[PDB]
């Protein structure tokens, strides 16, 4: 890792010109864009100046957009492998030889390098012996490309490398073009270079037209990941600090809410949490997330040191003066810690995400269960003032071990507003779930003790044991379902609306309705707690990658201002489910009981989880496409496949049919246009093999007889609808 990474971190403007000519055409190109090599986005607006360009649009796409190639994104463990980010503070110089099948070549050379603060690609196009009437040159290319791998070689000779990569491009008939793009990178300057070993970079490309341009003009849009080397399999010194400073802050300050576990002050305490989560959290990138966090534990820390003065202070205007500002600071810090956590601990991880706060609730519960022995310890030793001291000793002496240990993100800052998240239907029926659930435990915390002492005459360390016991229940049931939300993002869903409603059986069987006719015993109440305890832990982790993946679909910029504004929301949610809860958890109870109040809960519950179950059997449009029809025949024979394709209409879409025998690459096979009068297929299947479309069933059929030994092969299934998408395939023996 030289210097030159240093210029990529941020986004980058970027100038790009080209002048070529084919067959004695002329063409000129003038474009300018915005790149970021940190996630490997790049966005290009290309205009044509002389008039009708010859060449199709996607055929340029390579020669334009892929010399971008110095932002790509490096992983962690590829940075020593990097080169194009070696040579760029001076440039590198790009040849390239582009081979079409059947038809010429061109023959590139540009030049990339920073000019002041922007990036210019300088190229000279030049293509020899293509057909009037062919592909190319008449014009029968589509609109239309997909993504690829590049594979890329040293040379150690030439101080340069060598790479090689092979491109699909579609045609309105249903073929496809096969380039092959043979290509040399040399560093201008005689500095110190990064040779690289052997590696490919992924290449998803999706072209647009603006709709407010009447010149020729095309919006090219890139993502670019690299790949091919293996890992050791752990986490480097950043993700470990961020593990143990994540660990010190929820161990701190569980010690901090435990050992020492009016109603305007519980109303000022959630309510201007709520206001305190939303401006902190919305204003993350302009404070610091470090400066948020360290700021965050010295606050939480002068709580507690400062909590344990007001034995000495008399009561008067001084005690409300300094209750009403410990409670106020204690709201604060809470939610600046919280909302500078998720945002720091979400960004270290991009994709473990419900694991590693599953881990943070599980050190969590580790904070409870260790709270209060050693509290009891030092409080029957010493007294009630001395240990309320050295736990402010403890918050305190961790802020300077703790500024050294965490690391500097830093972002620009953000441009869309909290309305455009909000504004979401997906988002607030979450929100729901969140606020209700917050809700059900703020009406379960008060008013179990007493209904436990009024029924069956038992004191308040069994009812503090079955409230340890529900957390620790939640401490278990978080690590296990973050990791399988993780897992299998598709089963997030139903990881939640499930759990909801897990949770309003629970709200039923807690205290036995009058309705339901069962015998009221205690091991009832016990049982139900630890479920409900893990209905709520099940259903309380995947609600983060959730709204984070809607926003990512939504056209929020990745960064930390979406995980801040997320964290924002969540907080956000939680404290308006704690105000909630108790008061009319409270108001109902002495209205008409526990037992009803508890049914009113679930009621809740019951709604908010039957509109997202409603919501999602509602919505649901995926382009997933699925293979059917493997099977074994002798030569000779015949067979039928299909594949079953939803999230787009068939009819207004291209299909093509692919082949890769074992051991050897994919080779197209079958096309299917739009109108569906036109179909092309290769030589080795042509007349034995039909291409056939039910577009009622959105089904793709494809007919072979007379079944050769050379088709023993997997079978897949192609659409491009910006993005392709692959099918499964099947696995058809010919023996």
């Known amino acids: 890792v030289s210097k030159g990474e240093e210029l990529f971190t941020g986004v980058v403007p970027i100038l790009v010109e080209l002048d070529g000519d084919v067959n004695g055409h002329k063409f000129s190109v003038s474009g300018e864009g915005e790149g970021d090599a940190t996630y490997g986005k790049l966005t290009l607006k290309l205009i044509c100046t002389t008039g009708k360009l010859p060449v199709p649009w996607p055929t340029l796409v390579t020669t334009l957009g892929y010399g971008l190639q110095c932002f790509a994104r490096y992983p962690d463990h590829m940075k020593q492998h990097d080169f194009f980010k070696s040579a760029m503070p001076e440039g590198y110089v790009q040849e390239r030889t582009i081979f079409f099948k059947d038809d010429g070549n061109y023959k590139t050379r540009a030049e990339v390098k920073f000019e002041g603060d922007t990036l210019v690609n300088r190229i000279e196009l030049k293509g020899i012996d293509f057909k009037e009437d062919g592909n190319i040159l008449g014009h029968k290319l589509e609109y239309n490309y997909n993504s690829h791998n590049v594979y890329i070689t040293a040379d150690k000779q030439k101080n340069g490398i060598k790479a090689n990569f092979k491109i699909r491009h579609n045609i309105e008939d249903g073929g496809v073009q096969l380039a092959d793009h043979y290509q040399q990178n040399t560093p201008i300057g005689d500095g110190p270079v990064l040779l690289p070993d052997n590696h490919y970079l992924s290449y998803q490309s999706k072209l647009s037209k603006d709709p407010n341009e009447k010149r020729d003009h095309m919006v090219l849009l890139e993502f670019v990941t690299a790949a091919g080397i293996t890992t050791p399999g752990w986490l480097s010194r950043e993700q470990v600090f961020v593990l143990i400073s994540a660990a010190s802050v929820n161990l701190g300050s569980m010690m901090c809410y435990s050992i020492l576990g009016i109603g305007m002050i519980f109303g000022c305490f959630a309510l201007f949490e709520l206001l305190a989560s939303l401006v902190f959290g919305n204003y993350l990138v302009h404070i610091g997330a470090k400066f948020m966090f360290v700021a965050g534990m010295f606050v939480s820390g002068g709580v507690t040191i400062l909590f344990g003065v007001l034995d000495r202070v008399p009561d008067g205007p001084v005690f409300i003066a300094m209750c009403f500002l410990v409670r106020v600071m204690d709201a604060v810090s809470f939610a600046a810690a919280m909302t500078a956590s998720s945002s720091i601990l979400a960004k270290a991880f991009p994709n473990n995400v419900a694991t590693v706060l599953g881990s943070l609730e599980t050190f969590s519960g580790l904070g409870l269960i260790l709270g209060p022995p050693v509290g009891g310890f030092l409080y029957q030793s010493f007294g009630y003032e001395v240990p309320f001291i050295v736990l402010g000793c403890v918050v305190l002496l961790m802020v300077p071990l703790n500024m050294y240990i965490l690391p500097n993100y830093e972002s620009d800052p953000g441009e869309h507003s909290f309305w455009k998240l909000i504004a979401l239907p997906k988002v607030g029926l979450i929100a729901f779930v969140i606020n209700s659930l917050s809700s059900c435990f703020g009406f379960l915390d008060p008013t179990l003790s007493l209904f436990v002492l009024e029924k069956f005459n038992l004191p308040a360390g069994y009812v503090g044991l079955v409230f340890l016991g529900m957390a620790l229940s939640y401490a278990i049931s978080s690590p296990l379902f973050g990791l399988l939300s993780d897992k299998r993002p598709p089963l997030r869903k139903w990881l939640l609306v499930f759990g909801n409603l897990i949770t309003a059986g629970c709200y039923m069987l807690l205290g036995p309705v009058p309705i339901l006719h069962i015998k009221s015993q205690l091991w009832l109440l016990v049982l139900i707690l630890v479920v409900s305890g893990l209905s709520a832990g099940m259903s309380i982790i995947p609600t983060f990658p959730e709204i984070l993946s809607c926003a990512h679909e939504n056209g929020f910029e990745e960064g930390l201002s979406t995980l801040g504004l997320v964290s924002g929301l969540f907080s956000a949610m939680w404290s308006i489910g704690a105000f909630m809860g108790p008061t009319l958890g409270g108001f109902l109870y002495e209205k008409i009981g526990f037992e009803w109040a508890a049914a009113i809960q679930g009621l809740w519950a019951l709604i908010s989880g039957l509109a997202m179950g409603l919501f999602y059997l509602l919505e649901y449009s995926q382009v997933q496409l699925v293979e059917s029809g493997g099977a074994l025949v002798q030569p000779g024979g015949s067979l039928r496949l299909s594949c079953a394709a939803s999230g787009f209409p068939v009819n207004r879409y291209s299909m093509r049919w692919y082949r890769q025998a074992p051991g050897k690459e994919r080779e197209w096979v079958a096309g299917?246009?739009?109108?569906?009068?036109?179909?092309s297929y290769e030589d080795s299947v042509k007349g034995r093999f039909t291409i056939s479309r039910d577009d009622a069933r959105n089904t793709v059929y494809l007919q072979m007889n007379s079944l050769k030994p050379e088709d023993t092969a997997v079978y897949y299934c192609?659409?491009?609808?910006?993005?392709?998408?692959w099918g499964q395939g099947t696995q058809v023996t010919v023996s």
């Open positions: 192609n659409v491009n609808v910006g993005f392709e998408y």
């Open positions: 299917m246009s739009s109108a569906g009068d036109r179909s």
